Write a structure and sequence with these properties.
2 copies of one chain form a homodimer.
Chain A: H1 5-62
Chain A binds a DNA duplex through helix 1.
PDB class: transcription/dna
Keywords: transcription/DNA, protein-DNA complex, transcription factor, bzip, C/EBP, TRANSCRIPTION-DNA complex
Assembly: tetrameric
Chain lengths: 65, 67
Amino acid sequence: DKHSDEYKIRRERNNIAVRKSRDKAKMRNLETQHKVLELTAENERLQKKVEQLSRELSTLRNLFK
Amino acid sequence: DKHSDEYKIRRERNNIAVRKSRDKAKMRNLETQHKVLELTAENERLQKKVEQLSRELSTLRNLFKQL
DNA sequence: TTGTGTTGGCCAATCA
DNA sequence: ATGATTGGCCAACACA
């Protein structure tokens, strides 16, 4: 029964659980969107590093010439 | 007038828009999870490449030094 | 003003 | 029994 006290504490506690469950999921989804930003920046950095190292190797190999 | 006819049809339209909006959001999330796996594979490829070149450079520098 | 898209809350069923 | 999930729906508000 809606007027039942047990019912009331039930709804009160579930409303807290539901909000909590959904706030957690919103968090996880934002984290994933975040990882995409980090991985993208990091791959960009590493790619530039691949290019820097390649230049250093070419500069060294010119000494042979 | 939460008993009206205009009301019930307004509710129907919103409930449809809500399901559509939620499907779109969940799809977007699915795509993002995919983008992460993709970026992760690329990141590991780049890591190996940088390590490989660093060792190559190190070996080569050691050679010149040994002159 | 109106209509759709978003966001977040509630109820209830179901899982753990 | 209790907290976590999930899906249907309401309503305010953002966006056009």
